[PDB]
């Protein structure tokens, strides 16, 4: 197989009339279909259930955006049978054939990008560019993994020869596994976590987040049209602690690919370490969990550039990103100039229905709203509220961009993942102390430094202990291929997405010697 060198899918900015027209058209088509019901997808067919899952518009939660079937234990068993049956033959496809299937799915996704973006807007409250970035990232994962999988093809392993023998080492896929996905990147991460394992010959049972079941179904429409053989990919919307846990704990689940909260990741990793009755392998579990990400700014920085990057990083998709800047660490010389600029910019941010392309849409659910508001209450006891900190008018879950200052580094709002538009500002003496404060959390996902001082940047390169570090730019929006994505410490297992290393996680090696 020979295709063009990988390039990232351009993120639409909607600066042209044609792009805005195309978006409005997509928004209309999507809302005209709010009545739709999407079944499970098991063994190559759409299979309905008695019970259902309801998905709401977080900008107008009295409005249903769609319903799906609801997978329980019986449907999990059906999916397991289908996935193990498919594995027996899918594992034997030439890599070139599997890679071409991914490339087809990517081409189909690219053709439906406005529809998918519009679905993100209405289902999870992304503004237009956040939605476009999400879909473009999904396309990127498919294009990238299609190509990366060829680097592992039979027989890929470099071994030392021995006289009178052929020695041949090669990779084989593991089996059928479960993918458990979050609501915050429910096209990008959902797609990546499925197609990586699948590309190299695994089969997958995919469990979308409850808040993003409709857009997950639309991704499965693409997989179905692409023509993945029956059982290779399966769609099981349902309750995480029910069907999700059932699959995690199952003796016949070979691996678990999880992205989500630390709370859940901890349970999954623990369960994965147990031998279920009758289980005949050591389960692999990849858990990519939260962050408490900081941007450090020192007195040598471009303060206007820093302020812009901080606001983008803190408030993009309402701060509901594992990569979001939730801490702003300012050295004494940087404190007033940067804080004043951050406040001036943040106070100009618009909040409203996502479809109007505001700076911020709503948080995703009543539960998220409750969590973020509860953290705002905690923060009022720990630091000084200086901006926002309120729900805004309307049924939608609109929360104002929030800033706390004078926040102690060990404060709950400085340690715990709030996952909302809440920035904690911490004053430190110098760069050394900035790094100490940056590192002193249980997490290690993203981080940033604004500074012109070379020695500070290079010191951070060595010592700011996060998996994805950025200098003089935003700390969100890691691009597939460019910035292998994944953290340290309780940010998870360091499964680096959009990197060659990712696919190795879903392979095991056999060594076969013939003495002639």
Asked if 504 and 458 touch (Cβ cutoff 8 Å), the reply is: no
Show binding-site residues for L-glutamate: 184, 322-323, 477-478
Q: Which of 225, 16, 33 is CA-nearest to residue 118?
A: 33
Q: Is 503 in the site for a copy of itself (CB under 8 A)?
A: no
Total chain residues near ligand NAD (CB under 6 A): 31
To the nearest 10°, the Cα dihedral for 93, 99, 104, 109? Answer: 120
Binding flags for ligand NAD, 94-133, as an x/- string (CB under 6 A): ----------------------------------------
Asked if 492 is part of the footprint of a copy of itself (rule: CB under 8 A), the reply reads: yes
Q: Residue with CB nearest ligand NAD?
A: 240
Question: What φ, ψ does residue 20 adopt, rounded to 5°?
Answer: -70, -45
User: In the complex, what is the shortest distance from the CB of residue 466 to a copy of itself, in angstroms, rounded to a whole number?
Assistant: 8
Q: Tell me the residue length of the chain.
A: 516
Contact flag: residue 289 with ligand NAD (CB under 6 A) = yes
Distance spanning both ends of the chain, measured CA to CA: 33
210 interface partner picked from ligand NAD, Na ion, a copy of itself, none, CB below 5 to 8 A per type:
ligand NAD
Stretch that binds ligand NAD, among 54-62, 68-76, 193-201, 257-265 (CB under 6 A): 257-265
Q: Which residues, 52 to 91, sit near Na ion by CB under 5 A?
A: 55-56
Tell the smallest beta-carbon distance from residue 172 to a copy of itself (Å).
9
Residues 6+ apart with CB under 8 A from 80: 176, 205, 247, 250, 252, 253
Q: Measuring CA to CA, how many Å separate 183 from each of 25, 210, 272, 420? A: 25, 7, 23, 14
What burial class does residue 184 get, using C-beta atoms within 10 Å of its C-beta: 0-12 exposed, 13-18 middle, 19+ buried?
A: buried
Catalytic residue among 117, 123, 143, 288: 288
Tell me: does residue 288 bind Na ion (CB under 5 A): no
Pairwise CA distance, residues 345 & 343, whole Å: 5
| Interaction partner, residue 408 (Na ion, a copy of itself, ligand NAD, none; CB < 5-8 Å by kind) | none
Q: Find out whether 193 and 251 touch, Cβ atoms under 8 Å.
A: no
Residues 6+ apart with CB under 8 A from 294: 325, 326, 327, 328, 329, 426, 437, 438, 447, 448
- Out of 211, 288, 298, 369, name the contact with Na ion by CB under 5 A: 211
H helical segments located in 273-408: 303-315, 332-346, 366-382
Handedness of CA 103, 109, 112, 113 (dihedral sign): negative
Show contacts with ligand NAD in window 167-186 (CB under 6 A).
Answer: 180-185
Q: Are 372 and 400 within 8 A, CB to CB?
A: no
Our answer to whether residue 158 is catalytic in this structure is no
Please return the burial class of 133, using the count of CB atoms within 10 Å of its CB with bins 0-12, 13-18 and 19+.
Answer: buried
Site size for Na ion, by CB under 5 A? Answer: 4
Instruction: Residue 45: name the closest of 79, 96, 94, 7 by CA.
Output: 79
Asked if 402 touches Na ion (CB under 5 A), the answer is: no
The one among 98, 207, 218, 345 contacting ligand NAD by CB under 6 A: 207
Shortest distance, position 281 Cβ to a copy of itself, whole Å:
5
CB of 103 to ligand NAD, least distance (A): 24
Site residues (CB under 5 A) for Na ion?
55-56, 123, 211
User: In the complex, which residues of this chain contact a copy of itself (CB under 8 A)?
Assistant: 6-8, 157-162, 165, 167-169, 266, 269-275, 280-282, 285, 287, 442, 457, 461, 466-473, 478-486, 488-490, 492-494, 496, 499-501, 504, 508-516
Q: Which residues bind ligand NAD (CB under 6 A)?
A: 180-185, 189, 207, 209-210, 240-241, 244-245, 248, 259-261, 264, 267-268, 288-291, 322, 417, 419, 445, 491-492
């Amino acid at each position: 197989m020979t295709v063009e060198p990988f390039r990232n899918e351009p993120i639409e900015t909607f600066q042209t009339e044609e792009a805005r027209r195309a978006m409005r058209e997509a928004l209309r088509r999507v809302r005209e279909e709010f009545g739709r019901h999407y079944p499970l997808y098991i063994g190559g067919e759409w299979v309905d259930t008695k019970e259902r899952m309801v998905s709401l518009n977080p900008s107008a939660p009295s409005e249903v955006v769609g319903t799906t079937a609801k997978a329980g234990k019986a449907e999990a068993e059906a999916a397991l049978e289908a996935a193990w049956k498919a594995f027996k033959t899918w594992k034997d496809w030439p890599q070139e054939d599997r890679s071409r299937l991914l490339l087809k799915a990517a081409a189909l996704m690219r053709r439906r990008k406005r529809e998918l973006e519009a679905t993100l807007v209405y289902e999870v409250g992304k503004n237009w560019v956040e939605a476009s970035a999400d879909v473009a990232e999904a396309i990127d994962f498919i294009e990238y993994y299609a190509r990366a999988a060829l680097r592992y093809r039979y027989p890929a392993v470099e071994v030392v020869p021995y006289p009178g023998e052929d020695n041949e080492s090669f990779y084989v896929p593991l089996g059928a596994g479960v993918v458990i996905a979050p609501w915050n990147f429910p096209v990008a991460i959902f797609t990546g976590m499925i197609v990586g394992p699948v590309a190299v010959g695994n089969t997958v049972i995919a469990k979308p987040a409850e808040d993003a079941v409709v857009v997950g179904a639309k991704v499965f429409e693409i997989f179905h049209e692409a023509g993945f053989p029956p059982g290779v990919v399966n769609f099981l919307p349902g309750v995480g602690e029910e069907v999700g846990a059932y699959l995690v704990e199952h003796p016949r689940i070979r691996f678990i690919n999880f992205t989500g909260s630390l709370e859940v990741g901890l349970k999954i990793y623990e369960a994965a370490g147990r031998l279920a009755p009758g289980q005949t392998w050591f389960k692999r579990a990849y858990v990519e969990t939260g962050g408490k990400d900081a941007i450090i700014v020192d007195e040598t920085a471009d303060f206007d550039l820093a302020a812009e990057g901080v606001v983008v990083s803190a408030y993009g998709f309402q701060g509901q990103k594992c990569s979001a800047a939730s801490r702003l660490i300012l050295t004494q010389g940087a404190y007033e100039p940067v804080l004043e600029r951050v406040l001036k910019r943040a106070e100009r941010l618009s909040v409203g229905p996502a479809e109007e392309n505001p700076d911020l849409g709503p948080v995703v659910s009543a539960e998220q709203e409750r969590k973020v508001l509860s953290y705002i209450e905690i923060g009022k006891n720990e630091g000084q509220l200086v901006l926002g900190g309120k729900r805004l008018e309307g049924e939608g879950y609109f929360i104002a961009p929030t800033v706390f200052t004078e926040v102690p580094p060990k404060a709950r709002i400085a340690q715990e993942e709030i996952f909302g538009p809440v920035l904690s500002v911490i004053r430190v003496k110098d760069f050394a102390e900035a790094l100490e404060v940056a590192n002193d959390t249980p997490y290690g996902l993203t981080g940033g430094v604004y500074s012109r001082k070379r020695e500070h940047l290079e010191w951070a390169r060595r010592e700011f202990h996060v998996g994805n570090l950025y200098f003089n730019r935003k700390i969100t929006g890691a691009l597939v291929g460019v910035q292998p994505f994944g953290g340290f410490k309780l940010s998870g297992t360091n499964a680096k997405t959009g990197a060659l290393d990712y696919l190795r996680l879903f392979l095991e090696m056999k060594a076969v010697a013939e003495r002639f």
